[PDB]
């Protein structure tokens, strides 16, 4: 699609066999999702935004469907107030900003 | 332009006589920058992100050039780690997210 920005750019995602929704966020370097179970080994990380830092679990090579488009990459899990799709996955679906 | 997301989508911004850069951020409702030169009195506001909530300085009716395009609207000054152009101004310059 072509998504205008009068409201938050939220899309349906599928991760871990579950349908969720997430914000398409060109300001986020990495994808961060609310607490859930994912396969494989994780590594502890910190991410910082407005507000300060949070503790997250880093899982690698996770399959996610974004608005019907498959992407595979790193997913961070932790206490974000909203699920966020960052640039590491937006690049895999060929998302662009246009003006 | 049609901007890919392999690196941060930074663009030139001009406010008054000051040339700066800022992140085009579809995940930000509001535009927030770290400093503006001699901008006068502000109105207090709070905003929240990953991390928690911060006090910012709200300024209305600011004329800002964003990647060559003129916008007029609200700019927040506060402790943001990177200057961000949020949706309140992205809509004025006709930006859309595409995939
Ligand atoms: C501040 C940015 C450079 C970075 N952030 C992405 C950003 O889009 C967040 C994404 C976001 C969105 C909602 C809640 C928390 C975080 N937006 C945000 O803080 O916006 C603030 C200004 O406008 C307001 O509207 C939303 C909150 C306020 S972030 O969420 O801190 C972040 C940082 C690192 C990663 N990997 C993922 C996310
Ligand atoms: C996304 C979180 C689950 C990540 N964890 C953060 C941790 O502080 C959580 C933060 C936390 C807090 C509440 C709910 C989930 C996670 N605490 C926690 O798991 O506490 C456990 C012991 O008490 C039990 O009750 C709460 C969960 C259990 S962590 O994996 O230990 C970890 C630690 C350090 C870093 N940098 C990154 C990750
Ligand atoms: Cl530019
Ligand atoms: Cl002043």
Give the gap in angstroms from C-alpha B38 to the nearest C-alpha of chain A: 24
> What is the C-alpha separation between B79 and B73, in angstroms, rounded?
20
At how many Å resolution was this determined?
1.2
Can you read off the two tokens belonging to residue A70?
A: 């498959």
Q: Tell me which chain A residues have a C-beta less than 8 angstroms from the C-beta of B4.
A: 91, 96
DSSP tag of A96: E
**B74 Cβ contact partners less than 8 Å away, ≥ 6 residues apart:** B30, B31, B58, B59, B60, B61, B62, B88
Query: Among residues A36, A38, A13, A37, which one has the least CA distance to residue A23?
Result: A13
Please give the distance of CA B13 from its chain centroid, rounded to a whole number: 9
- Tell which residue, B93, B69, B9, B30, has the closest CA to residue A4: B93
Structure solved using which method?
X-ray
C-alpha B28 – ligand 1 centre gap (Å): 6
Q: Which residues between 18 and 77 in chain A have a beta carbon less than 8 angstroms from any beta carbon of chain B?
A: 23-29, 32, 47-54, 67, 69
Domain enclosing residue A76, as ranges: 1-99
> How many domains does the structure of chain B reveal?
1
Catalytic residue check, A25: yes
Tally Cβ neighbours within 10 Å of residue A81.
11
| Phi, psi at A21, each rounded to 5° | -130, 155
In CATH, what number is assigned to the domain containing residue A69?
Answer: 2.40.70.10
Report DSSP letters for B6-71, one per residue: SS--EEEEEETTEEEEEEE-TT-SS-EES--SS----EEEEEEETTEEEEEEEEEEEEEEETTEEE
């Amino acid at each position: 699609p072509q998504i205008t920005l009068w409201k938050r750019p939220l899309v349906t995602i599928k991760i871990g066999g579950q349908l969720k929704e997430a914000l398409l966020d060109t300001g986020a370097d990495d994808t961060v999702i609310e607490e859930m179970s994912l396969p494989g080994r994780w590594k502890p990380k910190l991410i910082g935004g407005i507000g300060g830092f949070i503790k997250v679990r880093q899982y690698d090579q996770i399959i996610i469907e974004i608005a019907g488009h498959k992407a595979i990459g790193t997913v961070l899990v932790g206490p974000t107030p909203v699920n966020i799709i960052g640039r590491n996955l937006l690049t895999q679906i060929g998302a662009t900003l246009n003006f």
